[PDB]
From a paper:
In eukaryotes and in some bacteria Ft is made-up of 24 subunits that naturally self-assemble to form a nanocage structure. The cage has octahedral symmetry, with external and internal diameters of 12 nm and 8 nm, respectively. H chains exert ferroxidase activity and have a high affinity for the TfR1 transferrin receptor, over-expressed on the surface of different cancer cell lines. Homopolymeric Fts constituted by human H chains (hHFt) are considered very promising nanosystems for drug delivery.
We also performed the encapsulation of TRIL, a 13-residue antimicrobial peptide, demonstrating that polypeptides can also be loaded within the nanocage obtaining nanoparticles amenable for further structural and functional studies. With the aim to verify if the developed disassembly/reassembly protocol can be used also to encapsulate peptides within the hHFt nanocage, TRIL and hHFt previously disassembled in SDS were mixed at a molar ratio of 1/1 peptide/protein subunit, as described in detail in the experimental section. Finally, to obtain a structural description of the TRIL-hHFt system, crystals were grown, and X-ray diffraction data were collected. The SDS-PAGE of the dissolved crystals confirmed the presence of the peptide together with that of the ferritin subunit. The crystals diffract X-rays to 2.3 Å resolution, i.e., a resolution significantly lower than that of the Ru1-hHFt and hHFtSDS crystals that diffracted to 1.57 and 1.52 Å, respectively. The structure of TRIL-hHFt was solved and refined up to Rfactor and Rfree values of 0.171 and 0.223. Also in this case, the protein cage is perfectly reconstituted upon the encapsulation protocol and the peptide is not visible in the electron density map. The spectra show that TRIL-hHFt possesses the same secondary structure of the untreated hHFt, thus indicating a correct protein refolding. Notably, SDS was not detected in the X-ray structures of the empty hHFt reconstituted after disassembly, nor in the nanocages loaded with Ru1 or TRIL.
Residue numbers in the entry: 3 to 176
The structure:
Amino acid sequence: ASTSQVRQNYHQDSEAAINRQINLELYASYVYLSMSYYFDRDDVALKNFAKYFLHQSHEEREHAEKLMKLQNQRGGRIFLQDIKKPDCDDWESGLNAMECALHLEKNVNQSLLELHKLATDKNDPHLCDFIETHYLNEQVKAIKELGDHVTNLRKMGAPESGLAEYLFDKHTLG
Ligand SMILES: [Cl-]
Ligand SMILES: [Cl-]
Ligand SMILES: [Cl-]
Ligand SMILES: [Cl-]
Ligand SMILES: [Cl-]
Ligand SMILES: [Fe+3]
Ligand SMILES: [Fe+3]
Ligand SMILES: [Mg+2]
Ligand SMILES: [Mg+2]
Ligand SMILES: [Mg+2]
Ligand SMILES: [Mg+2]
Ligand SMILES: [Mg+2]
Ligand SMILES: [Mg+2]
């Protein structure tokens, strides 16, 4: 029940919301790791899908670490939960994995916008600027890129066309 010497204008609800955001960023990292190694399978074998999702996985881990840094910067206390296994074992195709990534990045975005509404209600301009600076445009860019990718795969004839996924792997992701 004693307070951080650095803590100023940092609401307990914001502190809680940051810890929930940290768990969601580590979850995203885990989903992207899972997708990566699906495409490394001998019966899928799209090495540039695998490389693309592994890079996304490492990105999500940096998102988590920056939130852990912020928690400490503001004098909050990190509280960790189980990282849940990803919601798909089989991802069936390039298109389907990109579709799942798009839904994930939209879920992560919806959580960040909720976090921003809270920071606004608690009048925390530093936490607002942090979220705007480091997260909101990264999400908008990521969602747009996955949108683009999903559209290319669909137009090329995925997931029926194994040729479309092969060529997309070489031209877009290579
Ligand atoms: Cl405070
Ligand atoms: Cl408080
Ligand atoms: Cl837990
Ligand atoms: Cl931009
Ligand atoms: Cl070429
Ligand atoms: Fe993220
Ligand atoms: Fe070609
Ligand atoms: Mg291999
Ligand atoms: Mg990303
Ligand atoms: Mg479970
Ligand atoms: Mg503002
Ligand atoms: Mg600003
Ligand atoms: Mg700045």
